[PDB]
Amino acid sequence: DITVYNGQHKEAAQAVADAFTRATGIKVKLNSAKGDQLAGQIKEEGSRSPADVFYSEQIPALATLSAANLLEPLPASTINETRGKGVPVAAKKDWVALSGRSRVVVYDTRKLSEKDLEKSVLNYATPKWKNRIGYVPTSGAFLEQIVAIVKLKGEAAALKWLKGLKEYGKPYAKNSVALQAVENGEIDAALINNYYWHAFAREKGVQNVHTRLNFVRHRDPGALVTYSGAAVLKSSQNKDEAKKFVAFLAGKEGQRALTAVRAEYPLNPHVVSTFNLEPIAKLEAPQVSATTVSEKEHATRLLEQAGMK
């Protein structure tokens, strides 16, 4: 049996864990918390860590542990299951990308259609959308969006984007709050994560849902896709089946378990989501490196400068 450190959604992790158990008969305990805590928790424990597998929602968390020489190398077969143009690769082949969640723009189909949207998420910080576009300045995805713009266009365009949003758009406490707002007819559209919406339409019933998602594509900064992955620790005493778990995670069946409950694009190409998701490669997400401490530091300071925090 193994103990998994999970930074992923408990629902998404639960699915993979139980399906894994049916397929093999191996029990997988779960330790759930944010991707950061677990990574540092694993740093403090070191060679004396209970963690057998680290199921992180973010790649940096995997990186810090890879840079700290704590992760066990995965068989090329495993890391190959989800290989594809734009997918994150472990320099030391010591962790593997599993799923991806994208940035989107949900809008009110009662008022707007596609021809009514922008070709760049950047054009939303203009007078054309004064109080017509919403955002969540305190979201971790909103921070990633800053970090990505800076990396794709430069600091100048990032701060300009932020000041324009503050000047025109409208801030919402959480992502779901920005979606309900669009669904109520309080605001035309809003910048959110595709996952929060799929789960809303499935629960209600798409025919009772007025909101719709828009994807910018074109390697736009608005097409930013964040990846999740999994890794095994060198301190594992069940490395035998810890590997098997990460291998399941990347394998078609494991991909099917997650996508049966989660709306995250499968990196394994032989998998069909139960959610209306186009192949991940079709999103045309821009190429970007992992976010660093100083990078978040930088983006957070830009939020202060924009007057959002």
Q: Write the DSSP string, 71-128.
A: EEPPPHHHHHTT--TT----TTS-SEEEEEEEEEEEEETTT--GGGS-SSGGGGSSGG
Per the annotation, where are the binding residues? 9, 57, 195-196
Reading the block at residue 191, the tokens are: 């910048």
Supply angle C-alpha 6, 145, 119, rounded to 5: 130
Reading the block at residue 60, the tokens are: 């940096």
Q: How many CB atoms lie within 10 A of CB 290?
A: 16
Say if 1-101+226-277 and 102-225+278-309 have the same CATH topology.
yes
**Among 30, 16, 53, CA closest to 241:** 53
Sign of CA dihedral 86, 288, 226, 176: negative
**Alpha-carbon span 224 to 88, nearest angstrom:** 13
Per the annotation, where are the binding residues for Fe cation? 9, 57, 195-196
β pairing state of 225-233 and 189-193: unpaired
Could you tell me if 122 and 285 are in contact, meaning their C-beta atoms sit under 8 angstroms apart? Answer: no
Domain boundaries, the chain: 1-101+226-277, 102-225+278-309
β pairing state of 71-72 and 225-233: antiparallel
Cβ neighbours for 49, distance < 8 A, ≥ 6 positions apart: 42, 233, 235
H/E stretch holding 298 reads helix 293-306
Which CATH number fits the domain 102-225+278-309, given the four candidates 3.40.190.10, 3.40.50.620, 1.10.10.60, 1.10.357.10? 3.40.190.10
Query: What single letter denotes the amino acid at residue 35?
Result: G
CATH of domain 1-101+226-277: 3.40.190.10
What does each C-alpha distance from 301 to 67, 123, 164, 201 come to in angstroms?
A: 26, 22, 16, 35
- Tokens 């809008």 belong to 107
**Alpha-carbon span 44 to 293, nearest angstrom:** 19
- Phi, then psi, of 3 in degrees rounded to 5: -115, 115
Sign of CA dihedral 133, 139, 141, 146: positive
